[PDB]
Amino acid sequence: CWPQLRLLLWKNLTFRRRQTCQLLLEVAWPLFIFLILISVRLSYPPYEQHECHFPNKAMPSAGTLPWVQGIICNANNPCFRYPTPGEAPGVVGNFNKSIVARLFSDARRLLLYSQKDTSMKDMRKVLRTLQPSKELAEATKTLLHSLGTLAQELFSMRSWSDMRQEVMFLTSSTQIYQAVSRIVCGHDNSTTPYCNDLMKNLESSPLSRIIWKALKPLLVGKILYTPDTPATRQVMAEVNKTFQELAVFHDLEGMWEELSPKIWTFMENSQEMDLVRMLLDSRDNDHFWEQQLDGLDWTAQDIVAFLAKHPVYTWREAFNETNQAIRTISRFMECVNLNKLEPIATEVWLINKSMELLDERKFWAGIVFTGITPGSIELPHHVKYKIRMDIDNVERTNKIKDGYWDPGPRADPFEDMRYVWGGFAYLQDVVEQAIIRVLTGTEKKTGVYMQQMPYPCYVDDIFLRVMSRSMPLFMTLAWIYSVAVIIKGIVYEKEARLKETMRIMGLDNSILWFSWFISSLIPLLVSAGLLVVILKLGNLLPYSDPSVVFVFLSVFAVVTILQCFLISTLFSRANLAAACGGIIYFTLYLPYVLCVAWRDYVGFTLKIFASLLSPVAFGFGCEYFALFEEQGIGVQWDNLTTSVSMMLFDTFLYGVMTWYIEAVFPGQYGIPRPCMEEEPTHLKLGVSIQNLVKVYDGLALNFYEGQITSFLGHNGAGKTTTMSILTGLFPPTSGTAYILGKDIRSEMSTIRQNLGVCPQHNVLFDMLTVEEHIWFYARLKGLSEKHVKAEMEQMALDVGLPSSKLKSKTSQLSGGMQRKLSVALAFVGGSKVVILDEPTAGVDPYSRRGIWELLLKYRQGRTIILSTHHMDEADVLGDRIAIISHGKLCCVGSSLFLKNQLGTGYYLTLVKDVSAISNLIRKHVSEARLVEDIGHELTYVLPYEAAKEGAFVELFHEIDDRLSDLGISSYGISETTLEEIFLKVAGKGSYQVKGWKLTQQQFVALLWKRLLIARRSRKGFFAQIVLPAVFVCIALVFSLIVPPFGKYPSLELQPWMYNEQYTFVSNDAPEDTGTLELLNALTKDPGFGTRCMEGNPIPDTPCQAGEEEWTTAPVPQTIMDLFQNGNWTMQNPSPACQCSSDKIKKMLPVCPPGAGGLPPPQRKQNTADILQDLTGRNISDYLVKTYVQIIAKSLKNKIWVNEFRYGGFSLGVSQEVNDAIKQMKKHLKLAKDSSADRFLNSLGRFMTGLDTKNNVKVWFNNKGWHAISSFLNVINNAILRANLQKGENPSHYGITAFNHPLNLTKQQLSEVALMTTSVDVLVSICVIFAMSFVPASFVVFLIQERVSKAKHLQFISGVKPVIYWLSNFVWDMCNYVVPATLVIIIFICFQQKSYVSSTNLPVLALLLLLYGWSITPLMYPASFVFKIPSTAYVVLTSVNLFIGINGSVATFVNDILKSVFLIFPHFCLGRGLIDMVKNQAMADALERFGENRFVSPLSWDLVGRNLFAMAVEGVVFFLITVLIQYRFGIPPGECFGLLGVHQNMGYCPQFDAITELLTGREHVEFFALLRGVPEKEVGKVGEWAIRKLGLVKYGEKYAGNYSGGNKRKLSTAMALIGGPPVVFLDEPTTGMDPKARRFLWNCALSVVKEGRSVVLTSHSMEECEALCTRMAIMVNGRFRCLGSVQHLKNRFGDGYTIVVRIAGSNPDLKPVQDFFGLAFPGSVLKEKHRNMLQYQLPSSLSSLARIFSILSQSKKRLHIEDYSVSQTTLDQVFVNFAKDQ
Ligand SMILES: *[C@@H]1O[C@H](CO)[C@@H](O[C@@H]2O[C@H](CO)[C@@H](O[C@@H]3O[C@H](CO[C@@H]4O[C@H](CO)[C@@H](O)[C@H](O)[C@@H]4O)[C@@H](O)[C@H](O[C@@H]4O[C@H](CO)[C@@H](O)[C@H](O)[C@@H]4O)[C@@H]3O)[C@H](O)[C@H]2NC(C)=O)[C@H](O)[C@H]1NC(C)=O
Ligand SMILES: *[C@@H]1O[C@H](CO)[C@@H](O[C@@H]2O[C@H](CO)[C@@H](O)[C@H](O)[C@H]2NC(C)=O)[C@H](O)[C@H]1NC(C)=O
Ligand SMILES: CC(C)CCC[C@@H](C)[C@H]1CC[C@H]2[C@@H]3CC=C4C[C@@H](O)CC[C@]4(C)[C@H]3CC[C@]12C
Ligand SMILES: CC(C)CCC[C@@H](C)[C@H]1CC[C@H]2[C@@H]3CC=C4C[C@@H](O)CC[C@]4(C)[C@H]3CC[C@]12C
Ligand SMILES: *[C@@H]1O[C@H](CO)[C@@H](O)[C@H](O)[C@H]1NC(C)=O
Ligand SMILES: *[C@@H]1O[C@H](CO)[C@@H](O)[C@H](O)[C@H]1NC(C)=O
């Protein structure tokens, strides 16, 4: 079994090598795919980012100055890469090095000191006393002390010394930025054009691009509120106070203008300044000043120089600088809108005013209070308010998350930070604080800070994940090509009956399947190894062992090969299977991507039950590979095992299914599973049949060695069954068959080793040479190398191709040479018993004679068993003819015995009065009669038993005597043929219709034929109507699940919008009662917010009742010992872990347990979430470590990891001045209703609104889109509930905030309407792909009818092919229209207002109609150049899909492009659909906004140009299709057969040309309707033709299910429908059966005898000599008689043939042979047998009387028993004419 496997492997490798066309592409396709993949990979490098923290943002309630400082400088999330000091639980600053803060603190200190200072009083007292004494010295000392204290207080500021330097340095790109960052924080018709171009150059400068967007809605915006309720009025007045807190710079200009002259005259010409300047320079005061100054700068000399009078830095310069600064800050503040408060009556007017202000580019958010009942009391204890703002300034409310998870803290300052720079959080906090202050009436000041949670050193490698999760597509493209190739190969080897021949030679299917598996696995394994190598080298899958991926790809190759072995058992056409394999593989892989989208509810059992396919298992393996690759550790030898096990189970299942289907459902050739002469005993016996039986008798026949015995039968008895049983593959019955002494049922393998079989089909492999065939067959026989070479040389010498030009050439020989080689190949191995099956089927007589010579040369003891339907072959070759019938043996014996036992007498033929010759013959012969009389031919019959006494000689002498009297020109005599013995043993309409009505009749006939072939196709090509239907159905059901992408509902800001989350509360500095009560109110019965309190005022979220436990999670002993080691302080409280080392890219840092440090006490807060106490713990490090470890643990299980925590809280701790200011205002220059009073009040308010007792940091995760506002509302509600007194039941006390964006403007609606292409193009492509399936049926029907089936056969008669094409187009439109209408109704069923509208439906309908009308003729010329059916479907579908994708990409993107792309109807339909949807969307947007537009879609600009374009395109395409086709002596009753005007000629093609879906009578009815037969008598003509050509019992049956004889009879019936004067036939009886060819011959004779000549061409000379009368051999062409029949047999024919048999036997008589040789001089020994001789006499036919005389005289002397004399045949004359060429 090993040499056979080696031979099969060699044959497969040689088949693969000799092509040199598929293997190089099989190698280059995956190479190109992976090169494109690595080229795309090299363009997207991985994005690495270090771990970093974010600063804390200050809200307006935490002070105006810190809020402004946080807004201005740190507004870009610098991600400082280190824990900022603001994240510490104690300090909430990070603005300690600010200069503005120091200046404000120094100003506050100076203001507080100026009240207690009384130096002015002492100076006035000294001035009054001076205007020496005792109290004068004490007064002077007190004045000096006060002056020294004032100087020490003034010189300790040092704030203006830096601000002045900064402002002079302000008046190179990074220098100004650094100066601003140092001065701020740490490290047109409406307004004047001044602020206009100020803002213009601010937007035009690359310095405030991140600051102007945040400062625009602060000083330009405007706030509106509804309704006009006194409670709303109070809360908005509080908001206005909060806003005007920073209005101190407004009333400063008036104060400066009022206090400038006073201070000027006080410093210029006042006595106080004079006394101060006089007391500064002296002899003893210098030491006092030097001591009081403590060595600081600006000594007394500088003091006198600065405070001098009439003057380098004098106080006048500082005065002018202060004046200029006040002037410029007033000019800046002049256009700062601080009156942003507008009350509106109702909501719709508020929205209208909001849109109007948005059109004016000055509009901030608007508050809408719900449930107020205008006219009410202070508050209803539950305030509900919504904040409406522009969609470009707030986060979207349609979704709360990004969808698919990805690393990254989402900290973009502009794209995902609209809640900060948009102004939502600030205004929300202000409104919440105002509501709290109005509800409680308290004076507490609690600040709120926004701290963002840091991220633990993430990297971005999304491309790697996408490539590793979408691997199967690129991994299986080239493999789909390869499996298509191998499927084509398998189906080609199966269809050519090669597997049946291998099984006949003694081979099992197991070894064939194994050889195919190996030959398909070798190149697949090579490709898998190369792909593994290129993946390891190209850094596409690094840190991965090549061995595991190599074995994975090997298992994938094995399972794909077994899938192909399963699929190949369902097809019978090589090209069709090759085209369908890739589609089947694609639709079998599609389940993987279908399941990967809905994997949220996919269980393990469902995955296992769905893992019966190979692509889904490969996808699961690739997902596991990606999961183990994204963490940098890779996959090595250590899920995947389950995937490999499922793939092996799939291989086993595919193998079992293949073994089952091959047995139960085989092809059209397999078997499905649930007158006796004396036997010559002088030779050897090879086969012995004894009582063979079957399923519905007795067979006793013996075959001898040195004889070529025949086996005849009607193919209906037990002849073919017995021949098959003798060859094996069939279980025998209760009988015996001893082949060379071996029983069939006993041993079958020993018999097949020496048994040659030659079936009807020639067995020759393609791409192979004849010497390779000989070698392969000889090696499969079982011979050694020397015997193989000897047999090859002998066969090359015997066949007749001893030349290197034919031995090394492929199967390019003629049919005769191929048949001769196939016959000779059955004699390899020295087989002692051979069984032939119909040799020389359709070869010319020369190749027939050659094969006969080869068979006679291979007769030396080989037991040749002939089996053919030809009688002349079995007569001239069969030595013992055996004819059986009815399953039993009827006759057996030699040719002479069978002809002389039950045959008829000789047949004489005279070729030129018929009564004189008949009377003479009846006078000479006893019982003679006339057989036939045809044109120049008279044939009679004579009894063979008569004329034995010597009457033959006298008759021949009488004929030769008066031969010139009669008109006979030549005479001949022959014997009885074997065909007669085998047969003995077993349309007109009375008038023509050709004319004007003939065209209409042909049109209606073609339409009727097409309707009949389309109606009877319920099982055939009927999917062309239901497949586009379901395609459009699924395309529409896919378009009803996509959101409109233009809706923003009212989203309630609550932290419970997510399923599960973790919270935390950190009580820092637990020594204050306020922080303790705030923590209590935050962790009391009401809970965090308004989730559950006296009910559930939030939809679809009920609260839990009982959950209260302060428990700690267990900890292993390892971490316990690690932390008992010690040295774990606040700084570095846990072992950190590195991330993204060199050459190792890690998505998240992995490190051993103990990263968090300790499990904090967790407790469920009765709100579907748990909180953990983090008091006294490092918040940032703990959060980072817990987040990274939780994400790692959740990703290690592959459970679609999502966010873990969202928010947490950290509580901590941070009038006299006002009183002093009031005293100063009253004490000095007191006034009222002036600018000074207002400025002092504003300054006092600003100084008061900057100190906060306690504060809370709200840690929020920016991954949640609405996480900051939710927890802000929560902490505001907690602050509200903490400020309640006397126990007001804080359960029903809460504040609810909403987020509802305003209505979209015109531009936004236009962009939303235009952004629908991403949905429209998919529907357009799906509709195009569904509608491009109808013309494919028409084009494949045209291809099927084009290959000599119906086109040329109808063109033979007058059919006017233009009318044929017109009828085809009409029927295609009528078929296309019904399906188009059905699709339109299906579309109409659904409610798609974009199409069902009264202005979109008829235009949609006519567009589809025109698309069909234009696409029908486009594919018409594609059927011309296609010499294969059932294959253009997939190619044309791929071309249409490519054109559709090209049009879609062109529409995606221009005028000239759209103008020239109109030639494609798919592009036209796509553009029409796109324009229709766009017009509908624009009209809907205009109706929604309040406009009116009635633009009809039928305008020539939008839609209507494409319609005319497609119409003219279809017209010119039909014209081009019509023009392409055009490319711009035989007397009556003479069968003049060529032995090499349209309506009056009949034609019969060689190959059968019938439709497989029509009946027998319908064919002749259609052909009569085409031949000008009236519709009235067309049925009578059809019935007449049916009765003439037989098959009456099969008149109503599909012609496709007929047999060869039935198809030939149908062709003959069609050939004589109209009754032409001359009918042309080509091979009428080919491969038929006796008793059936005689019927066609008699029909032809009856046709020709009625005065209608026939012209028949064929290869069998027996049919020609039995039918034709004049062998018109047109060597020179045209018409030329070649001397009839008998004339040609007597003129150029050979001599006679005499077969003689001796009376004596055992074994023969040499004297008879000697006398026969001595009698005739030209006697040749044609065949010498035992008791049987035959001889040939050339050039001695004219003396036949003398030959008969000598035979009669020698019968008694030579002891002759039987004799026979016959003439030459027609095939002998043919080979004689062809041998001399
Ligand atoms: C919670 O836990 C985290 C870590 O788990 C703690 O964060 C640690 O403490 C500091 C955070 O404020 C970090 O100190 C910084 O370290 C930087 C690293 O630079 C190098 O440091 C190494 C020593 O590790 C030196 O040999 C090198 O020469 C480098 O200096 C320092 O650069 C940084 O110094 C600052 O530089 C800036 C700019 O020059 C100055 O303006 C500034 O004044 C300061 O000098 C600073 O020393 C520390 O690295 C960080 N991580 C670790 C592992 O310690 C938190 O502190 C914990 N929470 C609490 C409340 O303690
Ligand atoms: C809300 O505050 C604004 C300014 O903070 C107030 O507008 C001031 O008063 C009148 C307009 O009512 C103007 O003459 C002033 O110039 C405005 N600005 C300043 C700085 O005084 C407004 O009156 C306040 N409204 C309510 C209802 O309190
Ligand atoms: C608003 C009014 C009341 C402020 C009055 C205080 C002003 C006039 C005084 C107090 C402190 C003084 C400053 C003290 C220090 C210096 C640094 C020196 O190199 C230039 C002069 C300069 C800058 C002085 C300018 C004048 C000064 C700013
Ligand atoms: C006789 C042999 C040598 C030639 C056979 C032609 C083969 C190689 C060509 C002709 C038609 C081609 C197919 C046409 C359609 C498709 C569908 C597409 O989705 C995958 C490629 C696939 C499956 C092509 C594979 C290669 C193909 C089958
Ligand atoms: C900043 O912190 C320092 C301590 O390092 C402190 O002295 C200073 O007052 C702080 N600045 C503030 C709170 O503005
Ligand atoms: C805003 O949109 C809502 C949503 O339907 C609609 O009811 C309202 O009339 C619209 N208002 C304006 C001014 O367009």
Automatic annotation (TrEMBL):
Enzyme class: translocase
Official protein name in the record: P-type phospholipid transporter
UniProt key word Nucleotide-binding: yes
Alphabetized PROSITE patterns for the sequence: ABC_TRANSPORTER_1, ABC_TRANSPORTER_2
Catalytic activity: ATP + H2O + phospholipidSide 1 = ADP + phosphate + phospholipidSide 2
EC number(s) per entry: 7.6.2.1
Species of provenance: Homo sapiens (Human)
Record domain ABC transporter: where: 687-911, 1529-1701
Main location: membrane
Membrane topology: Multi-pass membrane protein
Cellular component, GO annotation: membrane
Protein origin, superkingdom: Eukaryota
Keyword line: ATP-binding, Disulfide bond, Glycoprotein, Membrane, Nucleotide-binding, Phosphoprotein, Translocase, Transmembrane, Transmembrane helix
Compartments where located: Membrane
Gene name per UniProt: ABCA1
